[PDB]
């Protein structure tokens, strides 16, 4: 019934079948889910569904640290229809039938950030007395960062739908149940949907890295 | 349900029946999947499906190392339709029926790189302190390179489709299930789809080669 | 399902019923499958299907070695239709029906190379330190060359088609299966399709020849 | 399914019922199947079908050796239709039905060569160090030559057709099989189709002759 993970998963699929690319849940702090930003701990309830927290990490601007593709377009339509109905030995005619047609008018822009600039970032002196040490140590999420800025300049348009129909009969008792809920969302221009993973380890003074998509969280920081 | 491996496999087929030519999964870092670039380790789950990592290898430009066909066209249509349906002794009418018509408007360009220039490349002094040694030794993918630049200048057009229909009956219970999902992708002009294999072995100081399509990975580097 | 061997086999048939003339698989390095070029080792899986590798052999240009018919036309159509269907004692109605109509607009040009020039080529001093000795000795394909340049100046037009229809029934279970895939390829002007065989033996210093169509590979070089 | 032997056999029939006159398989080196040229060894598989090799024999031009009818026309049509069908005790209805209508627009020209000039040719001093002695002795085909130049100045037009229809039934199993393949070839102007036989014996220094149509190959040269 969520829609906002779905569009990010079309982006994910356009990358790989549930592989490298990562998705976000919502877009108040997703526009601020740019580089140098965190994620929450991961649980496996109702599929892949993790937590999220989006504070900042910039500390110093002594040396050169903040110096600065074409439009990519997705007019796609994805259809998912399915009816599962089963009758029980208690003459219960359990039923369900859903259908959803999603229209995506996804627009994507790109802001290039250098890959060796990541190493330049570890070359930065990590020191900040912002009130995040206590909660960061309490959580120990071993936060990761993003590789490159994947920006959007979109119109306000996504659509969705589902249906459901359930019947039952326990003791000559009729039961019919129907529902048709169609949804759609106004999607705003300049927001962030999909991001990457690059592990960072934080000794209390200076940090170090761990390269490839380490979302299996274990660290003694 | 992937589409981006398919078009690369039309290129592969236009080379050989699943033989020499090699395919890529996606095209954010495929435009940067030019020469001097890596691939991930290979597994055999769900057919031939490997990993990918696309960092760079250029180290020195002391001597002449960076000095610099017509349009090739594919207006093809490939059709794949199939219905597999089987009934079980439990009166289950298991069903499935899919169909996909793919329209490819593939455009290809060529940027010539000399073959003896490969030997000139091994004649280069291999020395770089970029942070890749630790992860490269951890992975030991015995990376390979590409032979010649296979470039594209394309329009934004590929199409695809599938369908599915499944029924069932366990205890006088009706179940009907249908789905029709048609997809299409906007393909951008200047990207890389298919590449080649040429094995390189890396002693810590100076490297050496291994010629023909060694994708069977074993090396003690 | 390959098309590119087929057109070369129309050329082969216009020579002889699967006899002297030889075919190639694809045309990125087929334009560079001119004289002085190699082929891969031969296996007999799925009919006559060999490997291919297309590096160069020119070493010296001390003496006269690089000094330099009308258009031949094929507007043909070849039809191949066939239905094989068999019913099993398990009431399985195994079926298959294919059809393909191929339209060839083949254009051919000729660049004359002297036949005694072959002997002049063995009179050349064979000496080259290009990195091919190691892999050539590892392979031992006892490479052959081509007799005369068979060039093309073509338009972009070949067509093809196939169909298939399979049914089955194991335990009162219906199964119907159909597929219609029509293909066509844009054929480019100046490429090479068919070539010849002339055996060469390579002692490490100077080479020698072996005349007629020795594709049965055995040599102790 | 060959067409190029057929037209030569219309020429042969216009000479005699499979008698004196001889036919060729194809026409890349048939234009160079002029006088002083060879043929391959003969085998009796699938009717009269021999091998072919077309190198040259001219050695000297010291004395007069290279000093130099109307158009003959064949607008004919030959029809060949036939259905052979047989039913087996295994209720197999083996079938076959073919038909072919061939339209020949054959054009023929004549270049006169003197018959006593043949004796003048044996009067020539036979001496040539071209690399053909080794392979000629290895083959021992006791090559023959041609009597008179039978040239053509043709348009590009021959046609052909065949059909086939096969049915079967082994165990109440239906099988129907049909095919309709019509072919046609663009025939080029100045080529050679039919030639003659005159035996030559080659002692290592000087040669000798053997007159009439000795295609029964035996010689100790």
Swiss-Prot record, chains A, B, C, D:
Site (Cleavage): 79-80, 208, 213
Membrane topology: Multi-pass membrane protein
Cross-link ((Microbial infection) Glycyl lysine isopeptide (Lys-Gly) (interchain with G-Cter in ubiquitin)): 165, 178, 180
Effect of residue 221 to A: Does not prevent cleavage by granzyme A (GZMA). Reduced ability to trigger pyroptosis
Result of altering residue 25 to A: Reduced ability to trigger pyroptosis
Residues that span the membrane, as ranges: 71-89, 90-113, 155-171, 172-186
Chain segments carrying region Triggers pyroptosis: 1-221
Known outcome of mutating residue 16 to A: Decreased interaction with S.flexneri IpaH7.8. Does not affect ability to trigger pyroptosis
Localization, UniProt: Cell membrane
Annotated phenotype, changing residue 14 to K: Decreased ability to trigger pyroptosis. Abolished ubiquitination by S.flexneri IpaH7.8
Effect of residue 50 to N: Abolished ability to mediate pyroptosis
Job description of the protein: Pore-forming protein produced by cleavage by granzyme A (GZMA), which causes membrane permeabilization and pyroptosis in target cells of cytotoxic T and natural killer (NK) cells. Key downstream mediator of granzyme-mediated cell death: (1) granzyme A (GZMA), delivered to target cells from cytotoxic T- and NK-cells, (2) specifically cleaves Gasdermin-B to generate this form. After cleavage, moves to the plasma membrane, homooligomerizes within the membrane and forms pores of 10-15 nanometers (nm) of inner diameter, triggering pyroptosis.
Subunit text: Homooligomer; homooligomeric ring-shaped pore complex containing 24-26 subunits when inserted in the membrane.
UniProt name for this protein: Gasdermin-B, N-terminal
The species this protein was found in: Homo sapiens
Lineage, uppermost ranks: Eukaryota, Metazoa, Chordata, Craniata, Vertebrata
Gene behind the chain: GSDMB
